[PDB]
Amino acid sequence: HHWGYGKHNGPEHWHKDFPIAKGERQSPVDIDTHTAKYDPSLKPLSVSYDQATSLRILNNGHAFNVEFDDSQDKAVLKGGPLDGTYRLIQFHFHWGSLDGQGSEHTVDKKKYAAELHLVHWNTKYGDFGKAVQQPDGLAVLGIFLKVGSAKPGLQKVVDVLDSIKTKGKSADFTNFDPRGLLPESLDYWTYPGSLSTPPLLECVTWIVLKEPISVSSEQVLKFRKLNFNGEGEPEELMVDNWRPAQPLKNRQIKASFK
């Protein structure tokens, strides 16, 4: 936790302890919609969350994670650009201090108010720790949030945040259905990238949905009441916990749709 999103330890400093920060396959990136190629060989995504088992929600000092039982194939992502089966381990968000920033990926330089990451690991590697050491180890499904009407399926998340205000706090979070966080369309862009927080490993197939979900101002305002700090420490609101776009370098972004 020496790294963060503060005035002295933010993304521009990370390279000093994680030199891969200046690597060839870093995330997020700007998605230039005119340069992205429609790839008719890409398949529809298969999101199979009917048997998902959420367990717990944790403030880890950089975001909050809703954690799942990933001890068997009960919530998996397949298809799309992927070979094999990827198990859902957690989701979290990145968001801003105001609605005009917060997303990690951008679309023709447009920033959204927030971005949801549903993180999955390739079961061929047996565990998450092994998966992050492989170029096809993870699949992260990214979903933009814009501010408008409330997202009904987000409210259960919103309402527990008071109970995990500070770093290291957790709470039971069973029976949550992550299907309630999806947009209508599963059209997507995809490219090879990285984890966007340390250790920044280049192990991710990114799948970024084109259609944002709408959340209310009141919902995102509650994200912004969380704290980066621990209990009793000087209050530092958990806002602007997003990494900016990184150089695309020698990478092709592909679109699943015309």
Ligand SMILES: NS(=O)(=O)c1nc2ccccc2s1
């Ligand atoms: N972002 S980092 O290289 O991990 C980092 N920045 C800082 C600033 C002050 C003290 C420790 C660290 S560690």
Ligand SMILES: NS(=O)(=O)c1nc2ccccc2s1
């Ligand atoms: N923000 S993200 O690329 O989805 C992500 N980064 C990290 C870093 C360490 C462990 C898990 C994840 S998931």
Ligand SMILES: [Zn+2]
């Ligand atoms: Zn993330």
